[PDB]
Design a protein around this ligand. Sequence first.
Ligand SMILES: NC(=O)c1ccc[n+]([C@@H]2O[C@H](COP(=O)([O-])OP(=O)(O)OC[C@H]3O[C@@H](n4cnc5c(N)ncnc54)[C@H](OP(=O)(O)O)[C@@H]3O)[C@@H](O)[C@H]2O)c1
Ligand SMILES: NC(=O)c1ccc[n+]([C@@H]2O[C@H](COP(=O)([O-])OP(=O)(O)OC[C@H]3O[C@@H](n4cnc5c(N)ncnc54)[C@H](OP(=O)(O)O)[C@@H]3O)[C@@H](O)[C@H]2O)c1
Lengths: 287, 286
Amino acid sequence: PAPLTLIGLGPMGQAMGNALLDRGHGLTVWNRTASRADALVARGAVRAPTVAAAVAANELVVLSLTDYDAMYALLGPAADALAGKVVVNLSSDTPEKTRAGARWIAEHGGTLIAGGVTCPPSGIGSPESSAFYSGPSAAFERHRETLRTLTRTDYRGEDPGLAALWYQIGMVMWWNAMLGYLQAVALADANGLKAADILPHASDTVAGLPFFLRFYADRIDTGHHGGDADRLAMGTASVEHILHTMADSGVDTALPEAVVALFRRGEAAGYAENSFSSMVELLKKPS
Amino acid sequence: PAPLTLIGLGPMGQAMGNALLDRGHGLTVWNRTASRADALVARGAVRAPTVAAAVAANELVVLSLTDYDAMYALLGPAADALAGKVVVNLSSDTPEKTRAGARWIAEHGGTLIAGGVTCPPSGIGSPESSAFYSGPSAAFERHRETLRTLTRTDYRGEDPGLAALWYQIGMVMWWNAMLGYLQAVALADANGLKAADILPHASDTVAGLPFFLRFYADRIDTGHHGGDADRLAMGTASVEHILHTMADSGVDTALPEAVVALFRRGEAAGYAENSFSSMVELLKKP
Ligand SMILES: NC(=O)c1ccc[n+]([C@@H]2O[C@H](COP(=O)([O-])OP(=O)(O)OC[C@H]3O[C@@H](n4cnc5c(N)ncnc54)[C@H](OP(=O)(O)O)[C@@H]3O)[C@@H](O)[C@H]2O)c1
Ligand SMILES: NC(=O)c1ccc[n+]([C@@H]2O[C@H](COP(=O)([O-])OP(=O)(O)OC[C@H]3O[C@@H](n4cnc5c(N)ncnc54)[C@H](OP(=O)(O)O)[C@@H]3O)[C@@H](O)[C@H]2O)c1
């Protein structure tokens, strides 16, 4: 196993450091809050005295930070010593800001590989986990085996904005679903029900969603949103029932209102008799 | 196989009527659009000439209409014939509209059992189909074996609105995830990808949700909102990245702004260093 540097020891960074040590990689770590490296150092990791020494310790530098602005904040002061470094940035950001980070790293002599890890910390090191990757192909294949200690690698191409784009595409569905979980848990609590009580029904509901994703993927791609499978106006009545159920129980309604608002736009565009998938045409319009 | 009356012959009522005839139930049907009963009547179902005759023909009356206002419009003129009837209303609506409907059926001598079917029409009669049920237990227990012809019966309690409540609880996440799929498709199309291209990743995303449902289940229930797996402030940046990715790609941001606004309410309430699950404290009833 190759040696490498890991900067950023939040929930994800902690998990990566433990999985890299599990594999036997000579690991050099650094974190702004130094205390978060203690457990990894006790397991055999080398604590870098500074972030510059961390970068200098290896060719491969992995970052697990909140966003790309934290990269400039951490790597900025000693950016002159980034020449010849391979910076694998596993932080979420937009495709535009991801490209900007790649441009900034190249201008200082390094090369940036963009990554988007699609698993929680407990998923690091497991082969069922995956992560999108885009950036320079040669530098990626040169460090793919080390990156495969963390997750499976899904290389998307040369443009660094690709991995960030793919990460956002899945996360917009994920946050929508999990905020609906909190919304469902809040409704259950107002009626004397726990998250553990609604867990089986909530899990069965989301587990059947792939069948509908497949059924509507083919239909959306033909560009025709016929109301033969479902009628948007019936979806409006359904989400309105959710909203009023929430309000009747005294539960916050901010997100149910936003859902109803989009259906009302679908009806305002004349899509009442078409499938609810027709709203993908409103969603493609700017603003 | 007890006889019963079925009113409401849309796609759901059609499947129930066929499933009942399959098992051998004596079926009286009526629909506002009378031609909808043609296939069921050719199969042996008795067509009632009026809604009054339909209600008077049996003790068990099953409704499969749009909402509970449709029950008032339909049964209102025949409200006298409701005395002694057991109305099993399988239409989806809010718990409160269900409770008002139960009081209305009680005011006219009957008793209402509410049902929340969690399967499409093609699931009716299938063994793995299920429906929530609420209302007076004795009236439900006397007709449970007939209702079990349609789906499995999941009795949830005496409160008539309980069946609708459980239906709504599952539907919050279903619509949130499905609408998010449309958002992902639109973002994908603005960047040269089709729904077929992001379908495998979208399927992985939703199929991995039950792990996160279990992970945050007992944490939310015990009030443990620690930031060992996630900090809310990190999620704020993440949903801000989605929002500006939508904006940069020139697609709609209405729901991404609504998601960002909720996260910022979490920070505003002092939860920035807690897990994102702590936002349930903001969504809860006083
Ligand atoms: N959490 C997840 O489950 C998960 C999974 C996949 C993707 N991601 C992405 O992975 C990244 C890491 O998230 P996370 O949850 O592991 O942790 P996080 O809470 O976002 O923090 C990660 C690290 O960023 C550092 N950091 C943030 N802002 C900084 C700044 N201005 N200057 C210096 N250091 C800064 C923190 O340093 P300190 O230790 O000093 O605070 C911390 O070590 C994010 O981009 C996230 O979207 C999250
Ligand atoms: N279909 C599903 O995927 C599904 C799954 C779960 C449960 N459900 C719930 O099951 C119920 C029925 O589903 P569906 O697809 O059959 O709905 P639908 O197609 O809208 O059927 C509505 C039925 O109610 C009748 N109706 C509506 N308004 C009326 C009024 N004012 N007076 C008299 N009759 C009236 C209609 O009669 P006409 O024929 O004369 O128009 C029709 O028979 C809904 O509440 C739905 O949410 C549906």
